[PDB]
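#dry-run=false #mode=assembly
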Amino acid sequence: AENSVAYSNNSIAIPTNFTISVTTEILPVSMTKTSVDCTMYICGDSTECSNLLLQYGSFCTQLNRALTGIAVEQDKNTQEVFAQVKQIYKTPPIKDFGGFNFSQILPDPSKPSKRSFIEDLLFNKVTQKFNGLTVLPPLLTDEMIAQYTSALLAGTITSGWTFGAGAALQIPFAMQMAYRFNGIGVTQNVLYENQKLIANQFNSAIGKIQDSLSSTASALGKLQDVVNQNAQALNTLVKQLSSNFGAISSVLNDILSRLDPPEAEVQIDRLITGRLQSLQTYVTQQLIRAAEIRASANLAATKMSECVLGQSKRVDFCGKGYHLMSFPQSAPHGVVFLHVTYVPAQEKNFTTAPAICHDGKAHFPREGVFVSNGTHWFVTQRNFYEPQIITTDNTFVSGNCDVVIGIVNNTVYDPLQPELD
Amino acid sequence: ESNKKFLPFQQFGRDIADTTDAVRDPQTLEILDITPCSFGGVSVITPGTNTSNQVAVLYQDVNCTEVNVFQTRAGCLIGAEHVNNSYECDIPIGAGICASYQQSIIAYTMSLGAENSVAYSNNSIAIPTNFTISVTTEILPVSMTKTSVDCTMYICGDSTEC
Amino acid sequence: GKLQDVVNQNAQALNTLVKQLSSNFGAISSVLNDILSRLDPPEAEVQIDRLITGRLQSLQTYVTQQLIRAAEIRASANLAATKMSECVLGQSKRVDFCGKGYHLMSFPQSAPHGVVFLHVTYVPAQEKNFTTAPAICHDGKAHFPREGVFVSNGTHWFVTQRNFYEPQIITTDNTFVSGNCDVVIGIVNNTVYDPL
Ligand SMILES: *[C@@H]1O[C@H](CO)[C@@H](O[C@@H]2O[C@H](CO)[C@@H](O)[C@H](O)[C@H]2NC(C)=O)[C@H](O)[C@H]1NC(C)=O
Ligand SMILES: *[C@@H]1O[C@H](CO)[C@@H](O[C@@H]2O[C@H](CO)[C@@H](O)[C@H](O)[C@H]2NC(C)=O)[C@H](O)[C@H]1NC(C)=O
Ligand SMILES: *[C@@H]1O[C@H](CO)[C@@H](O[C@@H]2O[C@H](CO)[C@@H](O)[C@H](O)[C@H]2NC(C)=O)[C@H](O)[C@H]1NC(C)=O
Ligand SMILES: *[C@@H]1O[C@H](CO)[C@@H](O[C@@H]2O[C@H](CO)[C@@H](O)[C@H](O)[C@H]2NC(C)=O)[C@H](O)[C@H]1NC(C)=O
Ligand SMILES: *[C@@H]1O[C@H](CO)[C@@H](O[C@@H]2O[C@H](CO)[C@@H](O)[C@H](O)[C@H]2NC(C)=O)[C@H](O)[C@H]1NC(C)=O
Ligand SMILES: *[C@@H]1O[C@H](CO)[C@@H](O[C@@H]2O[C@H](CO)[C@@H](O)[C@H](O)[C@H]2NC(C)=O)[C@H](O)[C@H]1NC(C)=O
Ligand SMILES: *[C@@H]1O[C@H](CO)[C@@H](O[C@@H]2O[C@H](CO)[C@@H](O)[C@H](O)[C@H]2NC(C)=O)[C@H](O)[C@H]1NC(C)=O
Ligand SMILES: *[C@@H]1O[C@H](CO)[C@@H](O)[C@H](O)[C@H]1NC(C)=O
Ligand SMILES: *[C@@H]1O[C@H](CO)[C@@H](O)[C@H](O)[C@H]1NC(C)=O
Ligand SMILES: *[C@@H]1O[C@H](CO)[C@@H](O)[C@H](O)[C@H]1NC(C)=O
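#status=ok
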């Protein structure tokens, strides 16, 4: 949408209201751990064919090592993302966080595989030995992974930064948000005066999460395209057995039945040359595809150390807006974050001035912006409109009133003067 | 015996990739199913020849009724005893179970970590009294080996006719 | 291990490459010297070409994994350059980027085909428990701390920094006033010392 907001050299727009927004973000961490056996696949339990494969050197020694290097790596990728806490913290038995509910994300003491109320939905929107192909099971089961997210999340609501910097310390949540507010340059007096309103916004934003995850038909597209690619690359591998590759018959068994060894060996080599070359294609595809997952498994590793275990000043990564934290959530083959950010709203305009003339000396603001509501001038913080009387407690003196342009005339009240009288 | 219902004309059954899934009896006309004998990867768990010569063989995804035998989600361990303790596991088997050399090879349910609980009251804070400086190393690979191969040297081998 | 594996993987992928020259690929002999003096040249190309298409295919493979493995190093070399630019030539506020704890500085050390850092961090220890309060009333006005936390040991309220004990008597310069204290939930009364 086209927009054009008016700009003036002595005009500033300071927001007067905030709006807490919770935005999800889905990343893939690991994929299926496949493994292929050549003799069962290429040969097919044929002793005559097994001797022919020896002529091709050691092509399948590496083809089992290549599919194993990207098999232990997947179990490694899950380690950095989740296993970043030495000790498994536990939720306190009494939930009194000053109005914040957290029941939508905390573990649920109910039917087994004790996941959260949101993790249950995420496990429903994403949801074998035939010849050589197998599927190895992951080292970290979904039950154990859910405990890792039930230790980071269950502790970050009580300590904050302290997990990444030694033994955990106790801070009430009603006071922890004051730390978060002060990070974005907003004084803590805003929080305590608006605890009830913020808690309602915090709970309402989380409530819309599972009501929007279920509303959209496909919200897990990032985590589903990974599964589709793996299934598509595995289905095509099996169909390669139904191709002759230049031989009389696609199936290797009947060739030995009706052909002499002097002639069968000539045409079996067509199958072995084709099938072996048809297997190295997927191995190279997997190696490139695995490198595209580790590039995202490392992005989520940092986004769990920086967004979760602390407040990140990086703009527009830990959610869009002024970032505070991010409650991590499990996923079948990935991680789902819940970034809690601030989006200012309800804007108002004022006329500004870089300095103030009082007794021939400039008065720049110590912390805040000079604004006026039309007649009188005030000092307000950057991200929230709170006017205060201009005194020496929030201004400093430097230079002379002849070097910087745009100064207005006003009197800075000295708080010490009325005390003497 | 074939679970599926067939017809008296089709003899051979195929599912995917020219696999003879079902085959019809030519005399009794009782159509059956053909499946090969169960397969399984033989994974050898060893603590190294330097320590000792002992092996806990694991067969991939087969119950312990068709092969101290222990049954796991990834298969069955034969040669290792399962103990109800839980340590930071040594040899990663899979499905939340590992092995270690300690009456030699023992299978665990690996522990995530030392469980801790902290009380958090709305009017309680904890501020440290002291600091502890520490130096933690970190190792990263920067460069590789600058290899180079003469392609003609390989395939031909100083042979003009080749 | 992160530096030993890269040396071993390249040395092993190269070692398993040379061993591929002793494979028949269907020819009578795996060595090209004897196949020349034993076969007549109209009959020679059909058997040599088997080695041509077999050795070339092997060479085409290991070149590909070198390209893939080089991406695993370049991606790990841009990260190393980031560590040198940020943690060594400055102080980084990123959490757990350069060590468990709060970062101070790093010392880079050389290594064969790699680099080793020495991250110096803080791990606060020996914590002691207290009762706290978000604000303090005084003459019908709230009092929020400029920098620190209101901390009491049972009798008197102090103001201490978030990572150490600097308990000073609460004064008008350690706190800032923000309206009447009727909306703050859980405020505890105390007398704010006037230093004037
Ligand atoms: C505050 O911001 C601007 C300052 O005037 C006002 O926006 C006007 O409407 C559009 C953009 O929203 C511009 O084309 C105009 O130039 C703006 N200025 C006008 C009409 O004078 C906006 O209305 C102001 N809002 C308040 C409450 O003061
Ligand atoms: C703007 O700030 C005010 C209060 O700081 C908010 O107004 C409240 O809105 C809710 C419902 O929307 C009401 O239940 C309250 O009674 C209102 N309070 C007052 C004093 O009127 C408002 O939510 C904020 N606007 C935005 C977009 O965040
Ligand atoms: C957190 O969630 C809701 C907020 O609406 C609170 O009330 C529950 O709402 C659900 C309906 O979705 C009911 O099925 C429950 O019976 C309600 N009670 C409980 C204990 O779940 C809920 O109380 C809040 N949790 C708290 C305050 O601990
Ligand atoms: C906005 O500027 C006006 C002055 O034009 C101020 O509002 C008046 O301030 C006097 C105090 O000197 C009061 O007695 C009046 O009741 C106010 N009138 C109105 C309509 O508000 C005021 O200083 C400024 N508004 C602030 C600081 O909120
Ligand atoms: C702001 O204040 C200064 C001084 O208080 C004003 O400077 C005066 O400007 C007029 C016209 O040039 C001179 O005749 C006076 O001599 C100046 N005052 C003094 C004490 O020398 C200045 O004009 C004021 N500017 C605005 C925008 O109000
Ligand atoms: C809490 O800390 C204060 C500061 O030390 C203690 O107050 C002092 O206690 C000593 C004796 O232990 C007295 O000599 C001082 O006169 C006290 N100073 C003030 C300003 O009161 C206080 O005793 C401590 N409370 C507890 C329970 O240990
Ligand atoms: C903290 O705030 C004030 C301290 O004066 C106390 O409330 C006032 O005093 C009496 C009771 O002490 C109340 O009936 C009045 O409503 C209050 N008056 C004013 C002007 O605020 C309050 O009791 C103190 N709280 C505690 C736990 O001691
Ligand atoms: C803004 O522009 C007007 C027009 O030139 C000028 O009078 C005024 O001094 C300027 N103020 C600042 C701060 O530049
Ligand atoms: C005292 O400190 C311990 C931990 O060091 C904590 O378990 C306990 O809750 C604290 N008691 C009070 C009243 O703060
Ligand atoms: C803290 O929680 C308890 C609930 O047992 C409550 O009685 C008390 O008033 C709360 N303290 C504050 C300052 O809200």
